[PDB]
């Protein structure tokens, strides 16, 4: 029994983390085969970050201007190019620790594990979700740039590289092809995220995890997808699609509660609050577990 | 910025996880050098667990009755002994992936990372605390027995091996010398944990993490260690010692708030509740961060 915010084991990603230095700036990079991936703003001084012309700034740079360090070893840069907001530094050594991997662009609401790093060394791992407004609420200090987010599908699917913190204190970054998630650019200006919404299909997945673990005080009614969605829009919950009802099916089958019945329970929680109770140790509705996360934890995928 | 329940990177422990089989039972073991460590109840059938005589049960067993598997490799058992509630199976191969390590018995209130495993394969990692009543609120399914908890001090300090779930749904286990934490025995009977209490020094550490991250709405008064402790005992908070005030000193020095001032803020939160607000995204007072955890996260120890 029990339910925890669980991250994937991080061993496979640790052996890929290197420290990249250009000029005075040092951040983390991802070394797979003979390429090293890092945020392109490593080439920027602080004057540069107000209005960086990245092409122009990168043109002034040659291979030997990049100090890639792997542990104590120093790698040799024999090539550099800029794919979107990511720098690709080709080096002289294939990483012998390269796992099977894919690069993946995840969807808002999906979860992934983050290995937070500084100067190329891992410091901690945690689980989080891509918010509907394409930000993440992470834990990132200066020099954590280039820390990666990932899933393990038995193969490492890298989905996120950290670039920047917004004055909000929320975090933004790119996929491993350098395309930002969200409307953000790698520049030090005022950038607004959208209004955030709650991942409704994830909250329902968690209520099922709650029932699986003996927490059932919130159950009861029914409602319609259409009727439920009217309550959700009022509470800044993201609208429940039928894909979403389908994804919850196996969870429905193992608790013997129809999705639509579970939504009626949620509607009452949204309308009436929690009246001081807790669900799985939380006094709030938790939205950072996908249905796949719940099933992975509640039957032990390794 | 940002604050997350962060676990240590798990790479070093993954390369130590093996699958141990005796009879029909299969659980996880810890392979360091030429010894493999696992819960001794691996030798038990289900009839045995009501009233196991472990010496007698282990006497019927010979080395070849133990199937230790490391990945696909099968290790050769050339020795077996029982230290308290742990079995020590000596094998023919030193593990080439053995990190620098120590065995450590932690104290109630300390935190550690758990690598949850099944059949010798890692599935997830999470951070938790030894409760004052020596239980842990984990996430453990059948066959997760022998999963280990650990800290990384730059060296892996193993502090916990999981043995059993109580009807509560909370979890109990031993140090790596096989001595249970708490009053528990490895037997399937009714076993009561103590009344649980809140780790007061950890809650204060979290309020400091809250201030560090811009959440300051709860600040204000003063009070005395003696006066504060009177409020704590009423709310089932563990009493604040002067060691505890000392440990919080560096946190005090960097936020410019005296410990005793922070306690006055907490007293009012305990007495008056949170009135619907949140602190660092939580609607409850969080007690699973030590002051060392807060300092590790808020300045990036790797
Ligand atoms: O937030 C930013 N803006 C910076 C400088 C401006 C910029 C432009 C493009 C990309 C990143 C950045 C940057 O390097 N970071 C950081 C990212 N993560 C954690 C941080 C913790 C403390 C201070 C900065 C942090
Ligand atoms: O709780 C127990 N009691 C058992 C059998 C009785 C016993 C005696 C000594 C030690 C352990 C045990 C056991 O193997 N476990 C488990 C431990 N962890 C997660 C579990 C999830 C689901 C079912 C069991 C779980």
Bound molecules: the ligand O=C1N[C@@]2(CCc3ccccc32)C(=O)N1c1cncc2ccccc12
What is the CATH topology descriptor of the domain at 200-298 in chain A? main proteinase (3clpro) structure, domain 3
State the largest interface: A-B, 51 and 51 residues
Order of helices and strands of chain A: HEEEHEEEEEEEEEEHHHHHH
Main beta sheet strand tally, sense and closure of chain A: 7 strands, antiparallel
The count of strands of chain A amounts to 13
Protein name (chains A, B): 3C-like proteinase nsp5
Cross-link (Glycyl lysine isopeptide (Lys-Gly) (interchain with G-Cter in ubiquitin)) (chains A, B): 5, 90
Cytoplasmic side (chains A, B): 1-302
Active site (chains A, B): 41, 145
Short description:
Chains A, B: The active site is at residues 41, 145. The structure is a homodimer of 302-residue chains. Chain A is 22% helix and 26% strand.
Give a structural overview:
The structure is a homodimer of 302-residue chains. In chain A, the strands form two sheets. In chain A, strands 5-4-1-2-3-7-6 form a seven-stranded antiparallel sheet, with no helix packed on it. In chain A, strands 8, 9, 10, 11, 12 and 13 form a six-stranded mixed sheet that branches. The two termini of chain A are 16 Å apart. Chain A contains eight helices and 13 strands. The first copy, chain A, is elongated. In chain A, helix 4 runs parallel beside helix 7. The longest helix of chain A is centred in the C-terminal third of the chain and has 14 residues. Among the domains of chain A are: 81 residues, Thrombin, subunit H (Beta Barrel); 99 residues, main proteinase (3clpro) structure, domain 3 (Orthogonal Bundle). In chain A, a hairpin with a 3-residue loop joins strand 11 and strand 12. Chain A is of the alpha+beta class. One copy of the ligand O=C1N[C@@]2(CCc3ccccc32)C(=O)N1c1cncc2ccccc12 binds next to strand 12 of chain B. The site of one copy of the ligand O=C1N[C@@]2(CCc3ccccc32)C(=O)N1c1cncc2ccccc12 has 13 residues of chain B, from strand 12. Chains A, B: It is found in: Host cytoplasm; Host Golgi apparatus; Host nucleus. Chains A, B: This is 3C-like proteinase nsp5. Chains A, B: It comes from Severe acute respiratory syndrome coronavirus 2 (2019-nCoV).
